[PDB]
Amino acid sequence: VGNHTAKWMQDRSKKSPMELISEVPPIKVDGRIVACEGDTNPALGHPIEFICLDLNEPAICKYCGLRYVQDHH
Amino acid sequence: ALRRYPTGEERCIACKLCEAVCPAQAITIEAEEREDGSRRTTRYDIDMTKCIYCGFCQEACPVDAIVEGPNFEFATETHEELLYDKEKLLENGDRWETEIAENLRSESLYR
Amino acid sequence: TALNYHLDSPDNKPDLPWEFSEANQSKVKEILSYYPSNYKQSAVIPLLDLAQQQNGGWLPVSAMNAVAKVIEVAPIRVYEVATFYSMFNRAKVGKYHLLVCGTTPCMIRGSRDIESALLDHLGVKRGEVTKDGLFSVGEMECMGCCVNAPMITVADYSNGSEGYTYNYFEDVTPEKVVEIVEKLRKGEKPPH
Amino acid sequence: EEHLSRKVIIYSPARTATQSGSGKLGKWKINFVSTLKWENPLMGWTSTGDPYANVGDSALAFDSEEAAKSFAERHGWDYKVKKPNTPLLKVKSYSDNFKWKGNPQ
Amino acid sequence: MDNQFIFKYSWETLPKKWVKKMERSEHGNRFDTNTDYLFQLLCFLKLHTYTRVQVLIDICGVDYPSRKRRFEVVYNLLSTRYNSRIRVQTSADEV
Amino acid sequence: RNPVGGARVHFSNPEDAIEVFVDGYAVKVPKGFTVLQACEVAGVDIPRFCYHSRLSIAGNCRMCLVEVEKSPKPVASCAMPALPGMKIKTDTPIAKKAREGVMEFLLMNHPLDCPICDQGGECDLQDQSMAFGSDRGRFTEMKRSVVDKNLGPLVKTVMTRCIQCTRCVRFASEVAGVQDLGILGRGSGEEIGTYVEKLMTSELSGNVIDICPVGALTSKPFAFKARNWELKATETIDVSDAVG
Amino acid sequence: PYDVYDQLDFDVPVGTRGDCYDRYCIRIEEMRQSLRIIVQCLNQMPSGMIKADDRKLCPPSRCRMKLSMESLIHHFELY
Amino acid sequence: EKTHFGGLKDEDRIFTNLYGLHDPFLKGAMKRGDWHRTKDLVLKGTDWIVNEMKKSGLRGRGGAGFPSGLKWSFMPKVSDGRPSYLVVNADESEPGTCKDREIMRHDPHKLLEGCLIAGVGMRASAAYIYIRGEYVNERLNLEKARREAYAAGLLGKNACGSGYDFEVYIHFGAGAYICGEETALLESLEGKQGKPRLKPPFPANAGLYGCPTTVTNVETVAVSPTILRRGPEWFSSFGRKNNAGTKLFCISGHVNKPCTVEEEMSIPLKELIERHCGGVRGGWDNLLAIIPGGSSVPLIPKNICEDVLMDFDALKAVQSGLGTAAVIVMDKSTDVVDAIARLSYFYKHESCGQCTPCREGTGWLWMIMERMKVGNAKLEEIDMLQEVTKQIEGHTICALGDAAAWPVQGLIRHFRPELERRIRERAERELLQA
Ligand SMILES: Cc1cc2nc3c(=O)[nH]c(=O)nc-3n(C[C@H](O)[C@H](O)[C@H](O)COP(=O)(O)O)c2cc1C
Ligand code: SF4
Ligand code: SF4
Ligand code: SF4
Ligand code: SF4
Ligand code: SF4
Ligand code: FES
Ligand code: FES
Ligand SMILES: [Zn+2]
């Protein structure tokens, strides 16, 4: 739907990767920091990324787009 | 084939390592920041007629985004159809994901 | 939940006016007189300490901007000071600020036995002011050798800058710390 | 014949601005000013019809200005030499960060 | 017949004007000759009893555009009799 | 020996020159030059992160440590004034091991995002890790993480990569003439920022992209568009004004 | 010799006539000797690493590149 | 005497009000001998005050133990236009130390007189006293004494009638341990963050406001007038050679009676612990380790504590230091591994963050020490922990980076089998349970 996706995606039957990643709700974390590997098996994921959750907005993993939020505060 | 995460997000982050290492210069990439801030490609092309099927791109990729799949039966009647674009490669990954993931699990103990 | 950046809030935003009160400009002048007139930045710590006393024990961003104007520096230089030193509170605290949970020299003598009792009585968690805005609990700056640990610190901002005190109380037990908070509520200064 | 009369520039590439290391300077290259490229109208790939599109940066290098100049005139290329800019090493002191402002004026 | 013997023996027995440079290294013994002596030096190496350099492995050029004699012609040679290899090089220009 | 980068040295008077030894070799430098500058004159490239020739000396990254004769400790060459008779060693086991240790500390909390970092391929940290501290990584604990800050439409921020070199802070106060960037906090949790929300309004603000040695401060409109190795460099001049 | 050839047994067949028929027989015998070497290599095959461990030209394992900063930098440079 | 040291008698104590049983203010101070013939001392000149300081062998009381007389002589002899400043370090945030607080609590005029005496000996025009921000009562106590001195003509223009103009100003911090460092103190006094400077320049050449400056401890300053009145030879009579004078000690921890006391230099540690503090709790037999002075020196095991003397030189010879002479005593019941991991948190928390090895190394040492507390580590990780301390030591801007590595190095040097036992036990439990 966006201009970035329209450059390569000429098929409107399915949802774009941008919309698909926006649909998965943020993952709630007990703590201010979370490590994302992108896979249950770290060797099959992306390089480990440590994400700070100090902001109120959901924090995005810069590799896979998963979002994390603080569970309590 | 280009792969995705189980959420549907593309694995490729436009690092251009595969493009730099490709001995045949068969890969052409363009990229920019997506509307949500993500680092993603807007163009990913592989000239299947320049490619030498070496697997160097698969070795260079840090997120297991580009892979050489098990398919070998894709002869075409035109030169044009062998100029693979991003959408075609992502289609290949969708079609062959279950076999690719199985091979990656088996081969993970060696690389 | 101390953070090294500022998020705007109705009671904490630059547009809120903040000056030093007229009774406090006399104290400001003598502070500035201790240093050469072209080295006024030297007074940032006593002026921030004075500003925090006047504002009831905490430093809103408008207060840091006011101190920056007094010494004629960019406010980022004042922000650097306020975030570097642990005696400056950048979030609201109660009229009486209680400091518990000491460091290495005291916990050998069982310091971590007073904190849980204090939150239990106040019915709050750490860092949060009570509903009447009287009491808040924060981390304690530790001094001495803690021969008489457990120990707590009480900072009194109930009466602006002319009634400010910063005292250490020895032999504090789960039953003495309750007595301390009661006289603080009643207005009687607890002994030390 | 036709490619021997093109104008070139003999120059020493300067240090990049994104890195503080100096381990690429001292090199001398012949710029062929190959600036005729376009887009292929099937994929948009960068097309070019100039044989000297990339040889000046990939393979042709010279360790000195004189070596670069002699090769160009033997081949018949009309060249212009651009001298490289060099930094001036100036006296710096860590003590200057604490200089006394002087008597209050 | 190691690379030490060939280096030392060649210095004693070869005509002095034939060789300009001699390098002994694990990357290969290497004689740099002048263009007018290349033929005679190779004939000496082939026919002499203590060298017997009978096999010419290959001849290759190298381009050095920064040099007044840009081309370097490298002769790789083998002695099956003594199980040793020798490199002889010379420089040349476009004319 | 040729000075590093062909750097020119100007002498006010030949009498105002001192003699120093860099790895044995003898060099003549003006009085007031630092040990690092004497190394540059002697054609020796000393790794550095916090030092910039156009900014005040900071001496905080500790990557420029060299061995000086009769000195009990490794010396920060960027800050120490060179002296007559000084014997400077830059490749002895003390200097090499000091660089290895500092590099290990620098990469301790650095994020693993070279593939998504625009500095990749033109990164001082990558190169000096390749060259000086070629030490396999042994840090297995949890890295620290930092939230990103909004500095306007020109400077993109990823502060996990920041190595606290304070080059940007010093540029803002000494070159840009606008004091908006500072270093907030204390310890390993210190953060470069403006504290209050505000954008970099100086007309020279884009230069913090060049001086930041890591991908912490990058060009927002250029973000992810290309890698440095695929770019052709043309040396020209600007026509936006009459400065050239 | 190179690699482990000096620790292996094999014979070197040579001709006596220098004709096409000799070279045919030599290639047959070389195939027999090649079989001999393979059998010895199979039985003498030791365990251990199959890449050199100097982290200058050897790619790191996929697991370390995704876990260690130094390995990711090395992987970036090598490719 | 020359053979044994200790038992400092009551007529040889410089701080006669250490226990605070008498009035600390001006009237009580002159009765005790303060502000006595101060005009005569100033009229002797700077070269005599410096010379008598050198003969007294007074050493730096802030921890480094530098000869105070030589340090004062570093100051310029002729003013080049810039004024000279004396800065008094009352910023004692070191754990387990309160000697400077007691001096300001009960003997503020000794400090004030020392400021005037030290100022003359450095040709200084103004003194700044930097007090720890948490000493709010102590600061107000010194301020009351400072008004008493100004009102009586002892300070300010024409101090004590001597013709010497000297200003005394009081400044305070805001809760940072690093501000005790001399250059970090100067940065804080200028209104900046408490980040230590590199050396050179040295403060004697470019210190506060870039002017010649001497940063000295409260104890060093407060003893200078008494050294002048009673003479240096009396001062150097106490203690061994090169370790002369008296010292304020404060013993804490697992002793029968913790106390702060003034004793001779070079007094044996054991004698100080048993004779002054009633001995180690549970007998000298129950002793795991002693930290001699403050948390910035490595601990020493029970065998070393048997014969070591409390001076700068003796404690250096056993890979320790006198520091602030704050004695922390640990008996056999203490978890020494937990004790060191606690100190590692203190140094990680107190790092100013300026330089790379301290900013990142201190937190790495703390994380490892937290893992070694419960044995969640490998045996080989003890060697790595030693190597991490060596990467921090000697590569930092200031000495906090060194002070962070020393307690970890001492733990490995003296208690490695205790570490290994925890790791083996943890792996032993891991095998059986799962
Ligand atoms: C981290 C650190 C903290 C220090 N704290 C103090 C202190 O609280 N009081 C003090 O007198 N010296 C302290 N010092 C030592 C000072 O840097 C300096 O040596 C001292 O003020 C000089 O005083 P002196 O010569 O009288 O001993 C500290 C040093 C460091 C590295
Ligand atoms: S297999 Fe990959 S790396 Fe090899 S030529 Fe084809 S596209 Fe390039
Ligand atoms: S396919 Fe892999 S290597 Fe190629 S650009 Fe995408 S992430 Fe990088
Ligand atoms: S700054 Fe970027 S390219 Fe350099 S090491 Fe860090 S992540 Fe990699
Ligand atoms: S953002 Fe870049 S320039 Fe600024 S302190 Fe961090 S690493 Fe240095
Ligand atoms: S050693 Fe620690 S306290 Fe000292 S300057 Fe460096 S980071 Fe700051
Ligand atoms: S509990 Fe001991 S200093 Fe706070
Ligand atoms: S370059 Fe010298 S310490 Fe950073
Ligand atoms: Zn992820």
Side-chain angles (χ1 to χ4, degrees), chain C residues 12-54:
Chain C
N12 196 0
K13 39 187 185 69
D15 289 345
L16 303 181
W18 202 103
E19 314 325 295
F20 275 113
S21 82
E22 304 293 275
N24 273 1
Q25 320 252 350
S26 167
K27 288 198 238 193
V28 158
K29 286 186 26 81
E30 31 183 282
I31 283 167
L32 287 176
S33 94
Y34 294 155
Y35 319 101
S37 87
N38 54 340
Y39 279 112
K40 297 162 125 69
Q41 183 175 6
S42 285
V44 63
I45 282 187
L47 284 177
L48 276 178
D49 172 88
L50 175 67
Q52 175 176 282
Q53 270 150 60
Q54 184 190 292

Side-chain angles (χ1 to χ4, degrees), chain G residues 59-77:
Chain G
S61 69
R62 310 281 297 184
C63 41
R64 287 199 53 81
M65 176 178 73
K66 293 180 189 185
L67 262 175
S68 167
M69 186 76 255
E70 291 84 349
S71 290
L72 181 73
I73 290 173
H74 183 222
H75 170 98
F76 193 100
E77 301 306 65

Side-chain angles (χ1 to χ4, degrees), chain F residues 27-227:
Chain F
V27 296
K28 183 190 183 69
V29 299
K31 194 214 233 283
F33 269 33
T34 70
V35 167
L36 180 141
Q37 277 170 321
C39 284
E40 301 290 273
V41 168
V44 176
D45 223 324
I46 303 287
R48 91 285 307 281
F49 286 112
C50 74
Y51 175 72
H52 195 289
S53 85
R54 315 222 182 259
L55 305 163
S56 63
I57 297 162
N60 59 59
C61 84
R62 316 305 289 179
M63 200 63 192
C64 72
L65 290 184
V66 296
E67 173 160 4
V68 171
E69 199 218 29
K70 328 199 275 211
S71 195
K73 285 173 189 297
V75 180
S77 55
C78 70
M80 173 78 75
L83 299 167
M86 200 184 255
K87 293 179 179 179
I88 301 157
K89 293 167 244 51
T90 73
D91 55 354
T92 56
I94 282 198
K96 273 184 162 210
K97 169 174 235 53
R99 289 197 276 271
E100 270 181 52
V102 171
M103 182 63 45
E104 158 168 52
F105 290 133
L106 282 179
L107 302 175
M108 209 189 92
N109 293 270
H110 202 70
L112 264 84
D113 50 10
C114 297
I116 74 182
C117 166
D118 278 329
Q119 200 77 31
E122 46 176 31
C123 178
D124 278 348
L125 191 59
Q126 286 186 314
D127 302 336
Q128 286 177 207
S129 187
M130 281 326 267
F132 306 107
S134 192
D135 261 0
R136 274 186 168 272
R138 64 203 171 162
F139 179 77
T140 60
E141 336 279 355
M142 258 192 111
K143 295 187 187 262
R144 65 146 191 267
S145 187
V146 181
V147 302
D148 289 344
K149 283 100 181 149
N150 180 20
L151 301 168
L154 298 185
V155 187
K156 183 191 198 49
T157 299
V158 184
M159 305 312 282
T160 43
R161 307 169 189 158
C162 169
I163 54 158
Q164 293 81 48
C165 75
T166 76
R167 292 225 291 217
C168 56
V169 168
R170 276 137 61 215
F171 181 92
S173 279
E174 295 157 15
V175 182
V178 178
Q179 309 202 2
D180 54 349
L181 282 178
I183 185 134
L184 286 327
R186 179 220 296 176
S188 57
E190 56 176 41
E191 301 168 44
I192 297 290
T194 59
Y195 190 71
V196 295
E197 260 282 10
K198 79 157 61 132
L199 326 171
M200 283 173 81
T201 56
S202 155
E203 72 288 338
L204 296 191
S205 59
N207 299 300
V208 305
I209 292 126
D210 297 315
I211 70 172
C212 182
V214 293
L217 308 188
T218 53
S219 183
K220 178 163 291 171
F222 189 51
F224 323 140
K225 282 209 174 48
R227 285 286 185 198

